[PDB]
Subunit: 152 residues, 6 copies
């Protein structure tokens, strides 16, 4: 069992692709418990052209989305192990979002850390909760539940 | 005015491409409610990655879309149609709560945003409501955001 | 097989972002006619330069959509719904004539494509029809296109 | 009213912007007469991602759009000469198009040359006709009427 | 083999894709010897939205990148002839860059031409040098050593 | 001059913009002397769509561009100081590039640190040498001569 999971590994599990794959690396994975990953925030991202001009602030909902993706990594894997074939048939459905609070704006230069831990699961359904952090300080908090749907 | 088109939204809201997710405004009640909408089309960059071969408007972006409609209701409530101020402000998400996604939103759908204020208090606003495609609740959520100074 | 959604459209037409301008086929009748549409939203790249501070959907893209709708008509009319014969048949534009733009299309409009066959000769199709938004005609044209081999 | 114009000049005159500004240079111009300009076609254009994957073709409709923009340049400069403060207050709108023929496909590498003569003009409404040429060969034929409107 | 290649061919040999495929057509080619190709520069390129606003200047570094790809096409072609199947398995790593000189700026409407000659070469390593030219004039000269490393 | 500048400062001094502003933050700065800045590298960059499909590698040539800009920023503040004004006027333009060595491919998740120090400098022609590093190690090195045009 490996510790870190790089972009190539991520591409092999999550179905998300540019410009919606918002997780760059996985520094810690504990099946069925807690995942710690991150996405680098640079100014060279199309999203900054509109949010907002002359004041780049990484969208709050995209922080949520990032945590949701970090969680999804937990789901797919825990549910099948690091297996790209069994993962290529799925996608991830967002079911609920709760108790999310944004505390510090994220901007170019910040290492957006996703700290999530499972809270409950079953089948393709999983509920995860946690925070997003920059340089150790909390930037956001959230709870969300998702399903690993079928491409069909 | 009770209806507004993209021209006005561009003058009021600080958001721009690719983060302005509201096209037209159909109802507005200062300090009360506002319904609006955003057309979803395949000709949008997000669909390149969400998800290849299976385009699905990101759930988080439906929420953003509802937050913007609120922001527009908020801004006009505090200053009226005022382009010179809007450029001095930005919107900032505070919290998001009890948001549920029920039917996926796809290219071809007229994504309606229905919101009503629940807590007005100053710059800080709080609204709740649903997103609807063809008279059907596709999502629901409550959110709070602050219209604060730019810098 | 009367209503076709974006999913079905990707499997028939070779066009992809940012040049697939048809979001859903609402009517289709072999070798005769097709009714489809594409939603116009602000979150489209084209709007960054046409025109800044005044989003106007390009008339030529409206023609492009009508042609693409017609191409869907050709493909299915000639081979029913076949996702692979289609992976080997681009859509080349031959002529356009009698086109007229009447009402500017903008973000928030549903652009409906109404086309009928004027003449079919193998893979050389001549069509004609209009472009409508919320009831009124917005553009009208006639065009010819060939569904040649992809190489 | 010089005869040759570079993108720098085109920007101040035409309201069109990326990714809808399809004229890089003006080779020749004669008030209310004719205009010759061109647009280089490269693979490095977003339009090519979808038209068509694995087979790059510059859309015919854009060739038409390009000629319309050339006429526009010509019309702007004819109506008011080289003037950026009046131009800033205008937009160009397509009125009609007729007798367009697409003879040869345009692809990355080709130098898309536009050729237009004025068929009729009165006020903001201008009518022009001509061809689009690559290496001398007539790639396409087109006729169109466009108007200059106040951005208001 | 050949000595004239278009974008369909280029695409079949080099792994670069949008927005980093900076070579449109190969006009001249001599195995092991030299190579001449070009890329059309047009305002309808994303890079101009920022380099620079209201003053389009094709990035100097991108001129260099264009010469390396041209060198890469030449290298690949020299090593295996025209072979898409085998090329399909390679990447092009940049090794060293030297004696890079920018003389004239490259702007929209220019025909950025690549002139490369093979200095040294052993395995999947080729040190080449040449110049970038627009209208016969040398807009830049440079040297580099790329790497044709297998793709995985 | 100061010693900590954020994208909001960089924006006000460099002319580059999306998708060519390749410097996100300036952590350390000593006028006429050196500068230490950096650009975050994420997968969410358009460039990775073509360099390369299923194997994103930040282009070495963009690493150099990022180094140049850093020096450029150093150059301006190292004469007129953080002064948006003159800045809007003048404008960076690199005339040469020497001794560029690429040692480790940069990929999404790296924090490309820019380490530049002033070298053989004229007046409007600043030369700079230094390196780009990731997690302490040297991913690349290079020397550039830049002129503050107008
Ligand atoms: Cl936010
Ligand atoms: Cl979602
Ligand atoms: Cl076409
Ligand atoms: Cl138009
Ligand atoms: Cl440069
Ligand atoms: Cl490289």
């Amino acid at each position: 069992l490996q510790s870190q999971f790089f972009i190539e590994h991520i591409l092999q599990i999550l179905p998300h692709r540019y410009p919606m794959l918002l997780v760059d690396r996985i520094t810690e994975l504990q099946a069925n418990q807690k995942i710690v990953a991150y996405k680098n925030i640079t100014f060279n991202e199309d999203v900054f052209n509109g949010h907002f001009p002359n004041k780049p602030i990484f969208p709050g909902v995209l922080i949520v989305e990032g945590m949701a993706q970090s969680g999804g990594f937990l789901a797919f894997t825990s549910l099948w192990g690091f297996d790209p074939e069994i993962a290529k048939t799925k996608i991830v459905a967002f079911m609920t979002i709760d108790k999310v609070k944004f505390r510090i704006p994220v901007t170019p230069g910040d290492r957006l850390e996703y700290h999530l831990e499972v809270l409950k699961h079953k089948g393709m359904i999983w509920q995860v909760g946690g925070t997003a952090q920059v340089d150790g300080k909390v930037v956001a908090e959230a709870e969300l539940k998702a399903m690993i749907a079928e491409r069909e």
